[PDB]
RNA sequence: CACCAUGUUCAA
RNA sequence: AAGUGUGGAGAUCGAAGAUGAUUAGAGACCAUUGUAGUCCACACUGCAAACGAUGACACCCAUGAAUUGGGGAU
RNA sequence: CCCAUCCAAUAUCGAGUAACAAUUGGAGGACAAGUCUGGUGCCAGCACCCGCGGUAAUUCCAGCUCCAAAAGCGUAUAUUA
């Protein structure tokens, strides 16, 4: 089985940590990938690998090699995350990313072009993300335009449950560990900008591991 | 550091940018008459001219052959240039004065990878088609 | 020289010419809808296109804008009427989540699978370019022909087909002539 | 009532996240420097009462060394720390 | 602080 | 800075050049010299890694040692 | 002329290998599609670019089989994205 070390899934596990967005609210570290596929439903959450390519470390008689691998995952319906990991074996490597992708998990804000009246179709506001040279800037298009993208950031973006958007990408868009990884920061920027709606005060909470300190000293 | 503001700014701004157009060598070629005057189709495609003679170019490193290629002299404007015969064989279709239709190849008159100084390409010989003669569509006049 | 008569073009040929993505469901939609050809998709891809930008401009428009209650009202009007939406659909909204399937549905090839009159898609555009099929009384032999809600209750056998009631085709007509010089 | 709605009133956001108590910036979900410290409400007779007060601080505030100063802010407003002395 | 110049062409 | 013109100066270092030596060769480095120059006056030149490889003028901008000139408190 | 209509209205010719026969460029990558077989051996040639070829060629010359667009499809030069 999986025997837990944190905190956070031993509340996971106990069921006392109900949904995701418990743990995004306390900014709290995953530190455990199997906190995400026991919150988020097993069919619903897809993963498939971005990208994989070599990287070689020049030694005495020759060159190491190691592959790093790139993963995405998340339902379609605000959660993305992406992990890179490498590894000797090619089989390793799309493993460990896996892993990797799952602790990386993060929510996407999605919001309204004009007229509000169903689900969201894209994203708040403009918003870019910069990753080495590559920034990629995510602008909001109306509700029937589709996701205007390049293949890499467009397969990103359909994870994360956006429907709408128009893209922009700024220099060196052939390096995909920077154009993947841009992406993935300007989504995330996505619950950083304070739009008008949030100006209210909200009435602040206990934390997870504040309220269940009682049972969590059960487990010792 | 870079550039002008100001609401009454546009003769600066226009005088600005057609000088920084001649710097681009697609804007120049496009508009200059030296692109013209010294290609040697006349600012055209698949200029006429007569074989003179033919010539073996030795391939760049790091490739090694000889590559087959007559040199013609074109009808409309008398240059001397060489251009290639693409396929196995096909100097075997090529005699001295023939006419023929000569392509360039490629990269706007840039010299397409292998063969040194050679940026044309023999597209017809005799009036009839030089890739079909070698896939023997149909065979030489006379 | 000088004629005026008009001529665009009602397709385009997509960016990337090799998607393994695209090149999949292309030759899904030649399957289930008996195509000939990657063109008659693209062309079913611009006549969606344009609609699919007409009603994104109008959205554009406020309502109560002289531009989107009329010719606002005429895209949903063709819509309901050569069956893209059914009646329920009326915001505009719902033009802007047509899909190809949805067009592909509308041709004279697909109704005569789906009415009835045929066994296979194969069946259908075979009989309507062999001269069978009369939409109104109307032998119409375009495999394209997109036909309207209205038109879908008189699609029959034409009325001078072998099929229907007329003369005998020519597999039976040549070996009637054969038992005849005996 | 807080985050955006549909034009008919359902919320439709997920995760109406946490803001700074000293500079009113939305805490986000990575932002594993933020804090949120309880201090409890206290009695007439100095014993803890069950009910505490909540400030939660942005991780780029605790960053550049200007969280005390925040905290100190916070606590003379909601009156937990006095401002100075009484008169001798 | 004497002198100490050079190693054909592609490829692995 | 080198360079040029006309006058001065001409100690020292010293492009050119000359002798030694090293070297396979040495037209180089090293040693001994030595012309123009170096220095001044009046003209000319306007070619620098003329650099912070960072245009000018305003604005906002957290911290702790120092430092130069002016002013003010003790 | 074409197209359209027609093979009886008393009375009109006709598909089978439907021989009435689809081609043009590709199959290392971008870029969709062969670790197939024969030949040549840095030769001949290919290759827009990267690169193939030095006696076991995923790239040449061919046979097969596939891929793409299709009554079309290569190439060259201008010109817009
Ligand atoms: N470097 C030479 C290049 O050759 C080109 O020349 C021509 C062709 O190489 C090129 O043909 C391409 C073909 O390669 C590619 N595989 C598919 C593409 N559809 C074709 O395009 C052509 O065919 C379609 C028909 O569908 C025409 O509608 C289209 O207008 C035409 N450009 O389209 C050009 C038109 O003849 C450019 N003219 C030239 O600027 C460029 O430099
Ligand atoms: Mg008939
Ligand atoms: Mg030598
Ligand atoms: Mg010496
Ligand atoms: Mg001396
Ligand atoms: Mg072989
Ligand atoms: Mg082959």
New binding site residues.
Partial sequence: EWVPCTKLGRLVKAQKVTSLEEIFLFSMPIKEHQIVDTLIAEGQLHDEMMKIYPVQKATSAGQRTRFKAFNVVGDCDGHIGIGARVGKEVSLAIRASMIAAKLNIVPVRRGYWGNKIGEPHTIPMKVTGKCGSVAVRLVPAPRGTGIVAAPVPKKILEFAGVEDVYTSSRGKTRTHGNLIMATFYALRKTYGFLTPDLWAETEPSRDPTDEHAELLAEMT | ?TKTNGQNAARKLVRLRRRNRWADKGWKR?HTFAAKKANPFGG???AKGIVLEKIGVG?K????????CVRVQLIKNDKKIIAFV??????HFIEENDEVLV???????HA????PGVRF?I?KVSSVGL?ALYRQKKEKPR | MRNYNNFNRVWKAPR???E?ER?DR??KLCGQYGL????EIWRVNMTLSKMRRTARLLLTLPENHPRRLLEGSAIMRRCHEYGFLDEEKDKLDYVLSLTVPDILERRLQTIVFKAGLAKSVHHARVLIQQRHIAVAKQ?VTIPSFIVRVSSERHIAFAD?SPFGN??PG??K??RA??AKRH | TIGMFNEEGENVDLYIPRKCHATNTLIEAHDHAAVQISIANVGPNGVINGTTTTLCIAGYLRSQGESDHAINHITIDRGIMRIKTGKP
């Fill in positions: 550091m496009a055209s495609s698949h391939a490193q790091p490739n090694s052959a000889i590559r087959k693409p396929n196995d064989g096909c100097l392509s360039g190849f490629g990269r706007s008159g397409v990878g292998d063969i390409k597209v890739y | 990337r010419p090799f393994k090149l292309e030759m000939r050809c990657k063109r032998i001078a007329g003369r020519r597999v007509r040549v002539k054969a």
